[PDB]
Amino acid sequence: MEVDIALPTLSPGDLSALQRCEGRVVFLETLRRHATLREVALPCGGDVLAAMAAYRRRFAAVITRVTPHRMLATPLGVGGRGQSLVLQNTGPFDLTNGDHVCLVPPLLGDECLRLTSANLELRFPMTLPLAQARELTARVVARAAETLQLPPPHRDNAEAATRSLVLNMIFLLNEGAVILLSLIPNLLTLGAQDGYANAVIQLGSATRELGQLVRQPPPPLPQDHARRFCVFEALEAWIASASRLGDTLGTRPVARVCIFDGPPTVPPGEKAAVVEV
Amino acid sequence: MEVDIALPTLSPGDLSALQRCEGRVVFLETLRRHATLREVALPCGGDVLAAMAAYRRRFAAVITRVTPHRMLATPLGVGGRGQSLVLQNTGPFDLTNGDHVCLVPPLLGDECLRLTSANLELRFPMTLPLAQARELTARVVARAAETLRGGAPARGADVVFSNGRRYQLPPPHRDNAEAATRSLVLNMIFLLNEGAVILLSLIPNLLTLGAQDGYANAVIQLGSATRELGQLVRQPPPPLPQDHARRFCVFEALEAWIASASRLGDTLGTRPVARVCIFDGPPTVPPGEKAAVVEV
Amino acid sequence: LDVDATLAALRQEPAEVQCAFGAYVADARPDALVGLMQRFLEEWPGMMP
Amino acid sequence: PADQPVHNYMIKRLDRRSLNAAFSIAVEALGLISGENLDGTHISSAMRL
């Protein structure tokens, strides 16, 4: 399948600028075979949180050719996992070989191929490696939680992010989880005889600030402490949650980079082969 | 895209052992049509967390036929149409037909080739069905945790079933299970406690609601629309001037926790790498025996 | 003696107050210099985190 | 890894300058060469030459 995006008549002042966008990704809404350019288009920059929430509700598409009439595309993932294509990087950090990439809305705006003749503008999302996209989502959601190079939130959707976060956190509290919660001092004392044990604990740990301020008594034996065991259940639940906490706030990694011959690290603004996942 | 591996000739006898591992998986570094055996090697006594984190920055590849000269591999990530391929199951328990496999390090007692002629070691990761692996990880971690607090060291229920037969979950001291897993249990238990503490610090009165009518009502209201009982998160007290030795900004701690939790969740596998589509064979493949698979 | 530009450009950082004992004065009231020093010393750490 | 053969197409623009000089000739010569004021005296043709 090859999504076909039709174009209206264009002035030569912007057609030649659109030609340069040969390896960026756009977000359709329905996967019909044909679709006009006006359809696939997002308003000018605003509320990076809302936009990041919108990328979840639509499936991406990367474009390959730009003819004076017609502009092709490719629906990224609907049935395929090995359609090796090429897409250019537009994020600040240079993405290296091996790691996955995730789509993130742009910061500060200023990335808008404002077309005057057609009277519309596009905002192609930037591409970041997973390790840094996670951190960016963390920073933005924390800042949203603060309000009860950086744009301010809107207080209408930030509450939705807070709701998702607080739900995913609330459902960690289990009658088994308290058993683990009981050994905070037994953990700190273990984080003293060795080096790695102390290394795993952070500095503003938000728990060392607790284990040295409050004593907790032995836990109450739960109902039927003979038949079943609770710590196992709580830990399994926590694995199940944390395996899917990153995506529920940001976006799943959409493709991983593979290059057969070129230099490993590809700089910003340069195309690099890829395979999707 | 099939890569070959130069093989520094070892000896008779050992080469037979290398021939016996004609089905396992190996983690390459980069997709080049050549590679030296010295490259795909890991000290078979190693930290499980770091190995599981490194498994992401590599490519899986299965060892097809081997010869005294070289051995041929086939990567799994990139591929055309997802062609079939053979795989040697090496987990502790069998895997059925029509499910998904996942790659985890040798969490329990380890097995590792010791190629004494070439003086290098190899680790071949286990091959587990999805849910059973996601539960076995929790099993080993929970056993280590129960041991940690010096409580009742045994409960006779550290056992896992799979297709009838009962498995024993070998004792946790065999190779280095008291040392090569400490990192994992620490890094998991700590994050769990930190998440709990942050939540309780943002909502101080959560555990003083109705035992059955308040907490459930709060959860159901939170899951539903925007009432939220006002700022259900009470405004935390104002922090210190960031040079006082006891500054504590709760929100930056929440930020660090989100980041670390996401990172830990991604470096755990649990995203299927293949799927057994065996055909013309016994529907249940026992451990140690090959099994037809199609990559996902 | 051109500081107006320096200040007008340096105040972009919102704020941070490390301490206040070093840059604050106060107009005393009568009944001074016997118990007034006592009223002062009692909260001397109150100015120095 | 191996490297592919790379090409590159580049163009470069010209630079444009000029030159000039001055040749101001007098008025008496202007007249006499044209002969408009040349009177048939044996002394005028010498001035023409």
PDB file of C-alpha atoms in Angstrom, chain A residues 81-84 97-100 130-132 134-135 137-139 141-142 145-148 155 159 162-163 165-173 177 179-184 186-187 190 194 197 200-202 204-210 219 225-229 231-232 234-240 242-247 249 252-253 256-261 275-276, chain B residues 1 29-33 56-60 77-80 134-139 141-142 145-146 148-150 155 157-158 182-183 186-200 202-203 206-207 215 219 222-226 228 231 233-236 246 248 251-266 268-271 295-296:
ATOM      1  CA  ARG A  81       7.696  -4.925  10.413  1.00  0.00           C
ATOM      2  CA  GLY A  82      10.507  -5.044   7.858  1.00  0.00           C
ATOM      3  CA  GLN A  83       9.663  -2.454   5.214  1.00  0.00           C
ATOM      4  CA  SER A  84      13.105  -0.869   5.231  1.00  0.00           C
ATOM      5  CA  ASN A  97      23.192   2.909  15.093  1.00  0.00           C
ATOM      6  CA  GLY A  98      21.394   0.255  17.079  1.00  0.00           C
ATOM      7  CA  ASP A  99      18.757   2.148  19.028  1.00  0.00           C
ATOM      8  CA  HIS A 100      15.094   2.841  18.384  1.00  0.00           C
ATOM      9  CA  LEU A 130      14.242   6.383  23.074  1.00  0.00           C
ATOM     10  CA  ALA A 131      16.557   7.110  25.998  1.00  0.00           C
ATOM     11  CA  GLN A 132      16.083  10.868  25.667  1.00  0.00           C
ATOM     12  CA  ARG A 134      11.602   9.133  27.875  1.00  0.00           C
ATOM     13  CA  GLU A 135      13.415  11.847  29.846  1.00  0.00           C
ATOM     14  CA  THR A 137       8.277  13.159  28.615  1.00  0.00           C
ATOM     15  CA  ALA A 138       9.285  12.827  32.263  1.00  0.00           C
ATOM     16  CA  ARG A 139      10.242  16.495  32.483  1.00  0.00           C
ATOM     17  CA  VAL A 141       4.698  15.588  32.781  1.00  0.00           C
ATOM     18  CA  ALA A 142       6.408  16.534  36.042  1.00  0.00           C
ATOM     19  CA  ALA A 145       2.125  18.051  37.855  1.00  0.00           C
ATOM     20  CA  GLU A 146       3.715  21.172  39.347  1.00  0.00           C
ATOM     21  CA  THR A 147       0.756  23.302  38.298  1.00  0.00           C
ATOM     22  CA  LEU A 148      -1.969  21.821  40.475  1.00  0.00           C
ATOM     23  CA  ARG A 155      -4.635  23.390  32.717  1.00  0.00           C
ATOM     24  CA  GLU A 159      -5.100  17.263  34.308  1.00  0.00           C
ATOM     25  CA  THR A 162      -1.894  13.879  35.863  1.00  0.00           C
ATOM     26  CA  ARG A 163      -4.858  11.501  35.982  1.00  0.00           C
ATOM     27  CA  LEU A 165       0.039   9.150  36.011  1.00  0.00           C
ATOM     28  CA  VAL A 166      -1.712   9.030  39.370  1.00  0.00           C
ATOM     29  CA  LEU A 167      -3.746   5.997  38.323  1.00  0.00           C
ATOM     30  CA  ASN A 168      -0.687   4.068  37.163  1.00  0.00           C
ATOM     31  CA  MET A 169       0.932   4.954  40.484  1.00  0.00           C
ATOM     32  CA  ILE A 170      -2.056   4.235  42.751  1.00  0.00           C
ATOM     33  CA  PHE A 171      -2.443   0.708  41.481  1.00  0.00           C
ATOM     34  CA  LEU A 172       1.054  -0.119  42.766  1.00  0.00           C
ATOM     35  CA  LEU A 173      -0.115  -0.085  46.393  1.00  0.00           C
ATOM     36  CA  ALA A 177       3.757  -3.876  48.559  1.00  0.00           C
ATOM     37  CA  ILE A 179       5.883  -5.955  52.991  1.00  0.00           C
ATOM     38  CA  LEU A 180       8.507  -4.549  50.632  1.00  0.00           C
ATOM     39  CA  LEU A 181       7.910  -1.094  52.122  1.00  0.00           C
ATOM     40  CA  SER A 182       8.895  -2.555  55.479  1.00  0.00           C
ATOM     41  CA  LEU A 183      12.588  -3.135  54.693  1.00  0.00           C
ATOM     42  CA  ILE A 184      13.616   0.432  53.799  1.00  0.00           C
ATOM     43  CA  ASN A 186      17.124  -3.017  56.059  1.00  0.00           C
ATOM     44  CA  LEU A 187      17.819  -1.763  52.537  1.00  0.00           C
ATOM     45  CA  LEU A 190      22.603  -3.087  53.018  1.00  0.00           C
ATOM     46  CA  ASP A 194      29.077  -2.697  49.626  1.00  0.00           C
ATOM     47  CA  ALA A 197      24.377  -1.452  46.644  1.00  0.00           C
ATOM     48  CA  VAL A 200      21.922   1.889  42.775  1.00  0.00           C
ATOM     49  CA  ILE A 201      20.292   4.322  45.227  1.00  0.00           C
ATOM     50  CA  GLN A 202      20.063   7.858  43.867  1.00  0.00           C
ATOM     51  CA  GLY A 204      17.883  12.984  45.982  1.00  0.00           C
ATOM     52  CA  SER A 205      16.508   9.517  46.422  1.00  0.00           C
ATOM     53  CA  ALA A 206      13.187  10.566  48.027  1.00  0.00           C
ATOM     54  CA  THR A 207      13.490   7.394  50.122  1.00  0.00           C
ATOM     55  CA  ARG A 208      16.708   7.943  52.054  1.00  0.00           C
ATOM     56  CA  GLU A 209      14.967  11.126  53.146  1.00  0.00           C
ATOM     57  CA  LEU A 210      12.364   8.776  54.678  1.00  0.00           C
ATOM     58  CA  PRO A 219       3.774  -5.576  58.998  1.00  0.00           C
ATOM     59  CA  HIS A 225      -0.340 -16.032  55.115  1.00  0.00           C
ATOM     60  CA  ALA A 226      -0.057 -19.803  54.647  1.00  0.00           C
ATOM     61  CA  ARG A 227      -1.855 -20.533  51.373  1.00  0.00           C
ATOM     62  CA  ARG A 228      -0.657 -17.635  49.209  1.00  0.00           C
ATOM     63  CA  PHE A 229       2.224 -15.177  49.166  1.00  0.00           C
ATOM     64  CA  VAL A 231       5.206 -10.099  47.563  1.00  0.00           C
ATOM     65  CA  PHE A 232       5.310 -12.181  44.394  1.00  0.00           C
ATOM     66  CA  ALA A 234       2.863  -7.232  43.889  1.00  0.00           C
ATOM     67  CA  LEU A 235       6.171  -7.603  42.058  1.00  0.00           C
ATOM     68  CA  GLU A 236       4.546  -9.247  39.041  1.00  0.00           C
ATOM     69  CA  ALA A 237       2.000  -6.438  38.919  1.00  0.00           C
ATOM     70  CA  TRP A 238       4.756  -3.839  39.097  1.00  0.00           C
ATOM     71  CA  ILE A 239       6.662  -5.450  36.232  1.00  0.00           C
ATOM     72  CA  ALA A 240       3.489  -5.529  34.147  1.00  0.00           C
ATOM     73  CA  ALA A 242       6.442  -0.506  34.378  1.00  0.00           C
ATOM     74  CA  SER A 243       6.838  -2.387  31.098  1.00  0.00           C
ATOM     75  CA  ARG A 244       4.089  -0.116  29.746  1.00  0.00           C
ATOM     76  CA  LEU A 245       4.485   3.079  31.747  1.00  0.00           C
ATOM     77  CA  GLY A 246       6.783   4.854  29.312  1.00  0.00           C
ATOM     78  CA  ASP A 247       4.515   4.517  26.295  1.00  0.00           C
ATOM     79  CA  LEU A 249       2.734   8.982  28.613  1.00  0.00           C
ATOM     80  CA  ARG A 252       6.070   3.711  21.598  1.00  0.00           C
ATOM     81  CA  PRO A 253       9.389   3.581  19.736  1.00  0.00           C
ATOM     82  CA  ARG A 256      15.013   1.087  14.983  1.00  0.00           C
ATOM     83  CA  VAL A 257      18.011   2.275  13.007  1.00  0.00           C
ATOM     84  CA  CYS A 258      20.024  -0.146  10.890  1.00  0.00           C
ATOM     85  CA  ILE A 259      22.789   0.905   8.504  1.00  0.00           C
ATOM     86  CA  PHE A 260      24.878  -1.528   6.492  1.00  0.00           C
ATOM     87  CA  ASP A 261      27.729   0.555   5.138  1.00  0.00           C
ATOM     88  CA  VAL A 275      13.558  -0.575   9.749  1.00  0.00           C
ATOM     89  CA  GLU A 276      10.232  -0.221  11.524  1.00  0.00           C
TER      90      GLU A 276
ATOM     91  CA  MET B   1      21.763 -10.338   5.234  1.00  0.00           C
ATOM     92  CA  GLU B  29      27.261  -5.732  17.319  1.00  0.00           C
ATOM     93  CA  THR B  30      26.778  -4.291  13.836  1.00  0.00           C
ATOM     94  CA  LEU B  31      25.382  -5.666  10.596  1.00  0.00           C
ATOM     95  CA  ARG B  32      28.570  -6.405   8.672  1.00  0.00           C
ATOM     96  CA  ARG B  33      29.061  -9.452   6.522  1.00  0.00           C
ATOM     97  CA  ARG B  56      19.012  -3.962  23.499  1.00  0.00           C
ATOM     98  CA  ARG B  57      21.982  -2.246  21.854  1.00  0.00           C
ATOM     99  CA  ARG B  58      22.696  -5.351  19.777  1.00  0.00           C
ATOM    100  CA  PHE B  59      20.982  -7.556  17.196  1.00  0.00           C
ATOM    101  CA  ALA B  60      19.724 -11.063  17.783  1.00  0.00           C
ATOM    102  CA  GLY B  77      15.562  -7.594  13.610  1.00  0.00           C
ATOM    103  CA  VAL B  78      15.867  -6.589   9.967  1.00  0.00           C
ATOM    104  CA  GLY B  79      14.490  -9.090   7.475  1.00  0.00           C
ATOM    105  CA  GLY B  80      12.439  -9.733   4.376  1.00  0.00           C
ATOM    106  CA  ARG B 134       7.359 -12.362  33.042  1.00  0.00           C
ATOM    107  CA  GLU B 135       6.391 -14.497  36.028  1.00  0.00           C
ATOM    108  CA  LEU B 136       9.727 -16.296  36.489  1.00  0.00           C
ATOM    109  CA  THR B 137      11.532 -12.972  36.804  1.00  0.00           C
ATOM    110  CA  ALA B 138       9.126 -11.992  39.569  1.00  0.00           C
ATOM    111  CA  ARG B 139       9.597 -15.409  41.178  1.00  0.00           C
ATOM    112  CA  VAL B 141      13.163 -11.477  42.622  1.00  0.00           C
ATOM    113  CA  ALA B 142      10.518 -12.227  45.255  1.00  0.00           C
ATOM    114  CA  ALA B 145      13.462 -10.243  48.655  1.00  0.00           C
ATOM    115  CA  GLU B 146      11.937 -12.652  51.167  1.00  0.00           C
ATOM    116  CA  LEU B 148      16.612 -10.189  52.368  1.00  0.00           C
ATOM    117  CA  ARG B 149      14.577  -9.419  55.479  1.00  0.00           C
ATOM    118  CA  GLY B 150      15.841 -12.580  57.186  1.00  0.00           C
ATOM    119  CA  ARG B 155       7.784 -21.726  52.071  1.00  0.00           C
ATOM    120  CA  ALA B 157       5.930 -22.854  47.099  1.00  0.00           C
ATOM    121  CA  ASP B 158       8.749 -21.531  44.896  1.00  0.00           C
ATOM    122  CA  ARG B 182      21.648  -8.730  43.594  1.00  0.00           C
ATOM    123  CA  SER B 183      21.730  -5.822  41.147  1.00  0.00           C
ATOM    124  CA  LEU B 186      17.957  -4.010  44.408  1.00  0.00           C
ATOM    125  CA  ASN B 187      17.151  -1.887  41.361  1.00  0.00           C
ATOM    126  CA  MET B 188      13.571  -3.169  41.299  1.00  0.00           C
ATOM    127  CA  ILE B 189      12.609  -3.107  44.983  1.00  0.00           C
ATOM    128  CA  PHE B 190      14.091   0.364  45.395  1.00  0.00           C
ATOM    129  CA  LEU B 191      12.083   1.847  42.536  1.00  0.00           C
ATOM    130  CA  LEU B 192       8.886   0.226  43.799  1.00  0.00           C
ATOM    131  CA  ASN B 193       9.338   1.715  47.263  1.00  0.00           C
ATOM    132  CA  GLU B 194      10.168   5.115  45.780  1.00  0.00           C
ATOM    133  CA  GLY B 195       7.033   5.173  43.658  1.00  0.00           C
ATOM    134  CA  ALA B 196       4.920   4.280  46.676  1.00  0.00           C
ATOM    135  CA  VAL B 197       6.554   6.989  48.792  1.00  0.00           C
ATOM    136  CA  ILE B 198       6.114   9.680  46.136  1.00  0.00           C
ATOM    137  CA  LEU B 199       2.443   8.831  45.691  1.00  0.00           C
ATOM    138  CA  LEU B 200       1.780   8.893  49.425  1.00  0.00           C
ATOM    139  CA  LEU B 202       1.469  13.775  47.050  1.00  0.00           C
ATOM    140  CA  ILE B 203      -1.774  12.455  48.600  1.00  0.00           C
ATOM    141  CA  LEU B 206      -5.029   8.263  50.982  1.00  0.00           C
ATOM    142  CA  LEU B 207      -4.647   5.547  53.619  1.00  0.00           C
ATOM    143  CA  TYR B 215     -10.779   4.313  48.873  1.00  0.00           C
ATOM    144  CA  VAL B 219     -10.350   5.367  42.789  1.00  0.00           C
ATOM    145  CA  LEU B 222     -10.295   9.355  39.651  1.00  0.00           C
ATOM    146  CA  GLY B 223     -10.790   6.843  36.847  1.00  0.00           C
ATOM    147  CA  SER B 224     -13.935   8.703  35.787  1.00  0.00           C
ATOM    148  CA  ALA B 225     -14.209  12.406  34.903  1.00  0.00           C
ATOM    149  CA  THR B 226     -12.620  15.619  36.257  1.00  0.00           C
ATOM    150  CA  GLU B 228     -10.788  14.890  41.379  1.00  0.00           C
ATOM    151  CA  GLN B 231      -6.668  19.302  44.318  1.00  0.00           C
ATOM    152  CA  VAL B 233      -2.881  16.392  45.667  1.00  0.00           C
ATOM    153  CA  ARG B 234      -2.545  18.813  48.567  1.00  0.00           C
ATOM    154  CA  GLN B 235      -0.039  21.599  47.969  1.00  0.00           C
ATOM    155  CA  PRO B 236       3.267  20.259  49.329  1.00  0.00           C
ATOM    156  CA  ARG B 246      18.104  19.144  53.765  1.00  0.00           C
ATOM    157  CA  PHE B 248      13.685  18.178  49.216  1.00  0.00           C
ATOM    158  CA  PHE B 251       8.422  17.202  42.006  1.00  0.00           C
ATOM    159  CA  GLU B 252      11.996  16.770  40.797  1.00  0.00           C
ATOM    160  CA  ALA B 253      12.003  13.463  42.663  1.00  0.00           C
ATOM    161  CA  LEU B 254       8.837  12.469  40.814  1.00  0.00           C
ATOM    162  CA  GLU B 255      10.562  13.429  37.573  1.00  0.00           C
ATOM    163  CA  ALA B 256      13.597  11.269  38.324  1.00  0.00           C
ATOM    164  CA  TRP B 257      11.280   8.417  39.288  1.00  0.00           C
ATOM    165  CA  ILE B 258       9.318   8.612  36.034  1.00  0.00           C
ATOM    166  CA  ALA B 259      12.539   8.542  34.039  1.00  0.00           C
ATOM    167  CA  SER B 260      14.104   5.652  35.937  1.00  0.00           C
ATOM    168  CA  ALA B 261      10.894   3.609  35.897  1.00  0.00           C
ATOM    169  CA  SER B 262      10.477   4.024  32.142  1.00  0.00           C
ATOM    170  CA  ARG B 263      14.100   3.063  31.525  1.00  0.00           C
ATOM    171  CA  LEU B 264      13.829  -0.018  33.732  1.00  0.00           C
ATOM    172  CA  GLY B 265      10.590  -1.049  32.058  1.00  0.00           C
ATOM    173  CA  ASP B 266      12.145  -0.880  28.621  1.00  0.00           C
ATOM    174  CA  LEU B 268      13.283  -6.016  30.473  1.00  0.00           C
ATOM    175  CA  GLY B 269      12.401  -7.544  27.111  1.00  0.00           C
ATOM    176  CA  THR B 270       8.774  -8.709  27.341  1.00  0.00           C
ATOM    177  CA  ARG B 271       8.335  -7.546  23.744  1.00  0.00           C
ATOM    178  CA  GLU B 295      10.240 -14.204  13.331  1.00  0.00           C
ATOM    179  CA  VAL B 296       7.618 -11.648  14.323  1.00  0.00           C
TER     180      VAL B 296
END
